Amino acid sequence: STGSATTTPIDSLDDAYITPVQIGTPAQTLNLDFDTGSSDLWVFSSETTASEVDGQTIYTPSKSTTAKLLSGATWSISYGDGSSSSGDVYTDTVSVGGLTVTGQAVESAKKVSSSFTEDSTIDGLLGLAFSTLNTVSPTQQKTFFDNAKASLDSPVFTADLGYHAPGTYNFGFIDTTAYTGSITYTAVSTKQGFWEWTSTGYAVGSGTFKSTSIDGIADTGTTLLYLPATVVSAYWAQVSGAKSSSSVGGYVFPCSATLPSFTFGVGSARIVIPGDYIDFGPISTGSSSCFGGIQSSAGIGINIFGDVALKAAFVVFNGATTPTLGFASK
Ligand SMILES: NCc1ccc(C(F)(F)F)cc1
Numbered sequence: 001s002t003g004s005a006t007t008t009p010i011d012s013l014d015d016a017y018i019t020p021v022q023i024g025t026p027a028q029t030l031n032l033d034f035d036t037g038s039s040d041l042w043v044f045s046s047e048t049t050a051s052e053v054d055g056q057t058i059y060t061p062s063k064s065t066t067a068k069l070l071s072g073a074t075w076s077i078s079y080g081d082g083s084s085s086s087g088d089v090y091t092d093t094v095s096v097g098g099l100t101v102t103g104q105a106v107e108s109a110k111k112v113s114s115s116f117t118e119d120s121t122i123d124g125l126l127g128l129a130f131s132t133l134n135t136v137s138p139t140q141q142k143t144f145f146d147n148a149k150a151s152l153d154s155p156v157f158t159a160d161l162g163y164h165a166p167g168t169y170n171f172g173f174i175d176t177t178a179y180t181g182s183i184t185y186t187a188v189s190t191k192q193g194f195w196e197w198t199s200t201g202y203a204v205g206s207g208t209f210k211s212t213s214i215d216g217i218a219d220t221g222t223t224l225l226y227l228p229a230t231v232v233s234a235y236w237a238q239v240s241g242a243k244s245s246s247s248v249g250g251y252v253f254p255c256s257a258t259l260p261s262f263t264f265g266v267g268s269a270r271i272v273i274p275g276d277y278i279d280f281g282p283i284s285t286g287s288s289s290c291f292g293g294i295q296s297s298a299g300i301g302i303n304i305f306g307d308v309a310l311k312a313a314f315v316v317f318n319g320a321t322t323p324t325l326g327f328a329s330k
């Protein structure tokens with residue numbers, strides 16, 4: 001079987017993408033943030049502290065004839081940006097774009113951090129990293145992808161994120177009409193539970209390609225591109241007036257500048273990120289200082305190929321027994 005769903009940016013900056021997901025019987029449709037950097041499927045629900053809900057659609061297990069409380073199970077998660085949430089666990093039917101999984105763990109949020117409350121467009125997260133990272137205790141639970149794997153025509157999903165435009169998540173097949181040229185596959189390490197791989201180098205604008213190994217994770221749930229301080233300094237040195245701002249928390253640049261492209265290596269192939277993708281607009285309304293989409297990973301501890309990088313490519317997440325990541329231009 002296969003599934004296909006459209007994913008839509010939540011705002012004019014592509015800060016995140018939401019994808020409709022059907023939960024329960026009859027269906028309750030929630031718009032979830034598909035996150036290849038985590039492994040929990042959690043939702044705002046009728047159980048979420050009332051003051052912590054501000055416009056989100058909530059899941060109501062009591063109105064679902066297929067929902068079952070998973071007795072004794074709890075979950076608690078903390079994201080690299082400091083966000084967190086926690087609650088209890090149901091099992092229910094979950095469908096993404098025609099693809100149905102029965103008995104999926106649906107983690108009902110009883111408490112959510114402020115950054116989730118303020119994001120009215122995101123009803124929850126759908127984790128797509130490896131199931132070793134799932135936070136359900138005392139019995140760890142499988143992701144939606146792991147539960148669907150056997151029924152899929154091919155154990156793959158693909159991410160085709162749009163620049164200021166809708167895109168597509170496909171499960172179980174590779175749309176050969178959605179990319180140009182060939183797909184380049186590269187090895188994945190699952191040892192930290194992430195889709196972790198090694199980029200073969202980079203270039204800034206029309207500059208010389210620098211061959212150097214950059215280990216990092218493919219993370220649809222992270223907005224920006226976080227790379228080592230040496231790489232990030234080389235990029236922003238090519239932008240007149242750009243500087244790192246401690247008060248802002250990253251590189252900023254004059255909103256009147258034009259940004260160079262950024263190229264990253266996948267084996268012998270090159271993915272080019274157009275400079276416009278790196279512009280995240282003024283740091284506050286009316287400011288003439290703009291925030292950069294390439295930032296240092298020094299404070300994070302791991303390099304992150306977030307949406308800025310991924311939306312420049314057609315990306316295959318191959319969950320075969322030896323997992324791989326495929327990248328193609330589009
Ligand atoms: N998108 C989920 C996510 C967020 C943060 C991290 C970090 F910070 F641990 F790298 C990994 C995965």
Ligand SMILES: NCc1ccc(C(F)(F)F)cc1
Pocket residue numbers: 016033035037038079081083115116119122221222
């Ligand atoms: N990387 C996971 C993640 C995704 C979104 C958010 C936000 F936007 F709600 F803060 C936090 C953490």
